[model samples]
Target: STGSATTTPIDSLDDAYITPVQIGTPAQTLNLDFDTGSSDLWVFSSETTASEVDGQTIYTPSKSTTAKLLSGATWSISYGDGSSSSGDVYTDTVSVGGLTVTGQAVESAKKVSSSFTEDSTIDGLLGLAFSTLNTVSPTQQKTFFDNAKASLDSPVFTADLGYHAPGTYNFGFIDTTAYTGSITYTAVSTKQGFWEWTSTGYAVGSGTFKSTSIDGIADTGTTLLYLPATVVSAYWAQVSGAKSSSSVGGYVFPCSATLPSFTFGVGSARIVIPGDYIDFGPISTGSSSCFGGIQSSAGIGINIFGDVALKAAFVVFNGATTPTLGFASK
Candidate 1:
């Protein structure tokens, strides 16, 4: 009643993590982004436009005897980054790690955005957020976690993102060995269909901890950490040559600048992100300036504690009737 999976970064920058998913009767394996920010398990399929198909693998429902069309059902989802996909629905047997779900709603894309077509590393996304966020018309679909929750030893999953190595995702039970010390539990707001919570405060490097409540979502799908303008400015201010450049399109600093670490509070627990983790690599090929992994959430409407922050700690998406989020130092 439990399952485990290994998730690896698509590239050196750790822009995104992908996990191999087994779909269909014959098990068509595809690398999928296990996104915790959205709630629609979609895939590239044979139904996709020929021109839209790039180097990514496609799921052919016709080849899966267990695949059954969800007549009249369709779905479309758009991401904050402007990428999107739309397609019809099918019910089939889908398996992740060793966890299997029968009659799981598998959305097959008929059309995809240019960005999706350009990214050949991921075939599609498997949403992990609450099903309330599902975009399927007429009949919304449950996420993979929701569908597999009942059979799991416990309705919980954990994400342990690595710095420059492969990460781990565990379902049904918590692996005490994966984290150190005790896990800090926080109440989450799922009404918004995200694993959102409030941090007790923040601190820049060795500076005094600022006691404030900052609300944000723990989004595995997002690559960077977005906080309040004040927090971002304070952190960057400590770096001599760092500036928010319009030309660079984000906060950038001299590659040789020594960056300071960042810390966030989860109740009484404090998680620290190493200085180098904030240096998100060069701004361009052979460039001397590097972009920061933490940015301002000014126009974003909501703060996002993305992979940059999550990767610094062990995360738990607890799916009990009254959901909660757990964080621990690794």
Candidate 2:
């Protein structure tokens, strides 16, 4: 059996996507940010102090007959952008689209950082990474997908994030009709709780591929693409007015600046990231300085292939022993 959901793009971030999930007995639906960067199924809930929650739709586990408190088990998570959330645990039936997984641990948030609480559109996060990466302790919980994998016709999940339109996230099945050309897969290294691998090389434009193998992660929750300092400098150099900025954040260039396409390799398969995605948008409302979506991972350890990179192609997260990532043009 397969379960799929329509993922809609959020304008505020323009970097993330959210899908609905049904939790509890009578079905309490919440829009959750589907993130692969970290593992844990969490929701904004009645457990949260009223003063802390903004306008988020809260999930009241107490109302669900099937909800059971997982005493002494708690979960907390911190994101790369420094956003954090901590909550108590409960076991309930979680249904994603048409697929249902019973006895799923659903962490109900008691406290969330301003980063999450302020974002009223996101009720919680639905993590889609490996079960081993789950943050819930005392006894870690398996992801809804992991628990349902055995029954799936194929152990896979597909992410089809779009720019301004709705994209579909499919689990337990892959639709060949969704992508163009053959699916090109590269082995993924999951040591750091991420879908990471090295790129064969990169190019700023119609230039030759430079064999600079860079380590990076396919992170859907992240908004921009990050690379080593030098690689970023090389790419931004192509834009006449582009320069690194602290006041504006990341690299910024004139809104009128004409940009060139950036391409990267996964083994021998080269996927080109369109130039339009690189221009993230203005520094401030009505400002002439537009932020470059591609930036340097200076302090951060691993580079990230965030939404800017992922949305350019159809990505497959293969849940095999040694998991792999497959990509193709959409």
Candidate 3:
């Protein structure tokens, strides 16, 4: 079987992609961030403290007849951005679009960080990464995709994120019409518990392509594209009044600066990200200094091809023993 779901960007910069997910018996529909960087389908739930809860919709496992506590099972996770959450686990029926998975591990949050509390739009995160990354202790859990892959027409899922617009995530099958030309395939390493792959190289605007092997993870949960310091610095140098600012915590430049487009190689294919995408947004709400979408990954330890890059093309996470990633221009 196959399923298709609309994934909407939370903000104009496409900060995060939120998709509707149905959990429990009668169905508790909550907007969840489809995170490809981590594993564990967690949600804001009745178990969460009132102080930690904000405008997010809460999932009450007690209200669902199908919800069964995974006695003694617990989970905790900390993201690169420093946001964290921890809670007990439950098994329930979870559905996305029309695809359903029974006895899916549903982590019910009992504690959450301030960032998660203030993010009112997202109720939780649905992890799409490999099950190896699941945070559950003692008995690990498989991701929704991992469990559902066997029943799906194909053990694969695709990401088609849009620029400041709604996109789609398709499971079980690839939507060939959603992309153009042919898909460029690359080997993926799940050993790191991420959709990690090696990019051929990148170029600044229309500059010559540099043949360098840059290893990075394809993360839909992250907001920006993080590359090597050299590449990031080179890109910023093209823009006037651009500098890496410690006060703002990243590269910032005049809001009016005309940014240069970035091009990265996927095998022999080149995916060009429009200059506007790298502008990110103003450092402050109404400031003239804007932050950049591409930043140095030095501090991050690993490079991340986040939403900024993902939105430029269609990405496929082919779930196989020898997994591979496919990228296509759209």
**Winning model by lDDT:** 1
Q: Write the per-residue lDDT of candidate 1 for residues 185-261, one digit (tens) a residue.
A: 99999879999999999999999999999999999999999999999999999999999998887899999998899
lDDT of 2 by residue, 164-237 (tens): 67898999989899999888999898787788878788999898889978889988888899999999999999
Off by over 4 Å in 2: none
All candidates in order of TM-score, best leading: 3, 1, 2
Count steric clashes of candidate 2.
Answer: 0
lDDT ranking, best first: 1, 3, 2
- Candidate 3 lDDT over residue span 10-85, tens digit each: 8777878899999998999999999999998999999999999999999999999999999999999999999999
Minimal lDDT window, size 10, model 1: 273-282
Please identify model 1 stretches exceeding 4 Å from their true place: none
What does each candidate score in C-alpha RMSD?
0.8, 1.3, 0.7
Residue 150 shift from truth in candidate 1, angstroms: 1.1
lDDT of each: 0.94, 0.88, 0.94
lDDT of 2 at 41: 91
Q: List the lowest-lDDT window of 10 residues for candidate 2.
A: 9-18
